[PDB]
Amino acid sequence: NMKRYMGRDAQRMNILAGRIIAETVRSTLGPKGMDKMLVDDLGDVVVTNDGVTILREMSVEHPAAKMLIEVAKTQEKEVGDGTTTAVVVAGELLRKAEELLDQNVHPTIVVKGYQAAAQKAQELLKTIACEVGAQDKEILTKIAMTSITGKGAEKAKEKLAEIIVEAVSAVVDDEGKVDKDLIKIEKKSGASIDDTELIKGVLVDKERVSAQMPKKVTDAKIALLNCAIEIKETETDAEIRITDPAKLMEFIEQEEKMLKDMVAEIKASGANVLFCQKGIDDLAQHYLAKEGIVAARRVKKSDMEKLAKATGANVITNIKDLSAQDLGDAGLVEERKISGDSMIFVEECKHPKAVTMLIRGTTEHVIEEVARAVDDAVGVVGCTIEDGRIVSGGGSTEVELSMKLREYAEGISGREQLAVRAFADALEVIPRTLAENAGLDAIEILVKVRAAHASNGNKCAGLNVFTGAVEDMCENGVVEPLRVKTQAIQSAAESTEMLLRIDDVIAAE
């Protein structure tokens, strides 16, 4: 009871399971790579080139495969881009590993050399990484442009990269990190892809609470309330008792006087637009509309935190302590009807720490894929602002890193040496699969790039899938954050070091 694979069977069972889900994303890799169509049990379809979203949203049951998906799952988590490359490298480390295991090289020697090599790979990547200033907009734009390409050249429009760089640059909390959650991504239809705009504001999925209120306010002062604009019932249970018929109107007029007071306290701060997180009582909607104050009820807790950071307001839980300095400032607050639905556009803000990317396109599935292309572009721009180190793309720093590990291996005595050469040769899978998907001769090209790296220059030389020939990738404008490669290598090395240590499997049910 119940199923057990022994030694050479358990090792080949896993290595194969890893190689086989690594081959599932191989064809997506590069600008000349292809998309996959995934359907589930409900008939819901999603078409994408994003490696991790393919692996995450497909039913994988083999335990060794589930564990190599973790590599892509934590690559989007730490970087944003490079999910397909991390898995493909992990796959080719497994292939190159069984060639040693079939030559009787003990798994502990393989894993020893694999780790000695991934250590060297990290400290070799630090020396070959160009140093770049966190505000070099022309270089950040190339980094954003190289990320959108790879999902395809047609998605990579110039004006979209400039928009992305300007949005990531805005949400930087001095000093000095980039929060990916601060850039709100909204997906609406329209005849677009080119109509995707950067909104320096927030988009709230709510309408004006009363129709009598204005629908367009310019240079508006915005107040944010966590308090409920209703009657304040006491915590210790309370009940009123009326014995005089003339006391009826007393309590009602006193209660509705508490609502007149609250609306008059909001006008005292000078605020003409109001976003309440809790509910607003019906009488108070009438008094607000009479004052000319645009208000919205039951706004999401997450949208209140967006508005607060974007306009420059404060979330106040006590309407009595609403000061005039706790109001935010936005150049336009308007209720538009975009794509059928009506929403409140709070835009044109002065100094935003939160920003909305309105991603638009013709069909919902087109929109959803451009959205995934921006999540990747935001990830790499954020990584260059934090790290300040970039490397050349097009499989260029893999060839350079490959040849430097091979001459590092010559200086290693022992059979661990074979595992370091194996590791080096595995890295060359990125330049090779860029060529396969391009249509070009992978074997031939890999030799021209390898020979154009020997001695001194170039280091920045790699395959250009559009030109066909081997070009200088730095002068071309093909660049990635250092974190894309160091993470992809480390996570591929650590997960395959673990699978290789397995010699027995025990599967139930």
Ligand X SMILES: Nc1ncnc2c1ncn2[C@@H]1O[C@H](COP(=O)(O)OP(=O)(O)NP(=O)(O)O)[C@@H](O)[C@H]1O
Q: Which of 478, 482, 493, 500 binds ligand X (CB under 6 A)?
A: 478
For Mg ion, the closer of residues 303 and 376 by Cβ is 376
Question: With CB cut-offs between 5 and 8 Å by kind, which of ligand X, Mg ion, a copy of itself, none does residue 394 bind?
Answer: ligand X
CB closer to a copy of itself, 243 vs 455: 243
Active site residue 50: yes
* From candidates 91, 107, 382, 393, binder to ligand X by CB under 6 A: 393
CB 350 within 8 A of CB 331: yes
DSSP at 229: B
Binding test (CB under 5 A) with Mg ion, winner from 33, 150, 361, 394: 150
Residue linked to tokens 């290595």: 15
Interface residue with ligand X among 14, 18, 51, 140 (CB under 6 A) is 51
Q: Where are the beta strands (DSSP E) in 298-447?
A: 315-316, 328-337, 342-349, 355-360, 389-392
Cα separation, 148 vs 157, in Å, equals 8
Task: Please report, as residue ranges, which positions from 408 to 447 form the binding site for ligand X (by CB under 6 A).
Answer: 430, 434
Residues 6+ apart with CB under 8 A from 428: 398, 399, 402, 446, 450
Q: Alpha-carbon distance 19 to 87, whole Å? A: 9
Q: Which residues have a Cβ under 8 Å from the Cβ of 272 and sit 6 or more positions away?
A: 217, 220, 221, 292, 293, 294
Complex with ligand X: residue 150 or 312, whichever CB lies closer: 150
Our finding on whether 151 is near ligand X (CB under 6 A) is yes
Q: Which of 48, 53, 84, 433 is catalytic?
A: 84
* Nearer residue to ligand X within complex by CB, 297 or 372: 372
Q: Which of Mg ion, a copy of itself, ligand X, none interacts with 341 (beta carbon under 5 to 8 A by kind)?
A: none
Among 84, 192, 433, 495, the residue binding ligand X under the rule CB under 6 A is: 84
Q: Are 412 and 116 in contact (CB under 8 A)?
A: yes
Distances (CA, A) of 136 to 131, 140, 143, 174, 375: 11, 6, 11, 17, 20
Closest separation between CB of residue 290 and a copy of itself, Å?
A: 7
- Asked if 376 is an active-site residue, the reply is yes
Quick note: the x/- pattern for Mg ion over 75-94, rule CB under 5 A, is: ------x-------------
84 is catalytic: yes
* Amino acid present at 159: K
Binding mask 9-38 for ligand X (x = CB under 6 A): -------------------xxxx-x-----
For the question of residue 83 being annotated catalytic, the response is yes
Using the minimum distance from each CB to ligand X, give the nearer residue, 50 or 303. Answer: 50
Site for Mg ion in 340-379 (CB under 5 A): 376
Instruction: Residue 231: count other Cβ atoms within 10 Å of its Cβ.
Output: 13
**Smallest gap, in angstroms, from Cβ of residue 149 to Mg ion?**
7
Here the tokens at position 339 are 């794509």
**189 and 366 in contact (C-beta within 8 Å)?**
no
The C-alpha atoms of residue 203 and residue 198 are separated, in whole angstroms, by 11
Q: Which one, 7 or 455, has the nearer CB to a copy of itself?
A: 7
Q: Cα 275–326–336 angle (5° rounding)?
A: 30
Non-local CB neighbours of 43 within 8 Å, separated by 6+ positions: none
Q: Active-site residue among 376, 384, 433, 496?
A: 376
Q: Is 174 helix (H, G, I), strand (E, B) or coil?
A: coil
Catalytic position from the list 83, 146, 311, 356: 83
Catalytic residues, by residue number, are 50, 83-84, 376
Q: Which residues bind Mg ion (CB under 5 A)?
A: 81, 147, 150, 376
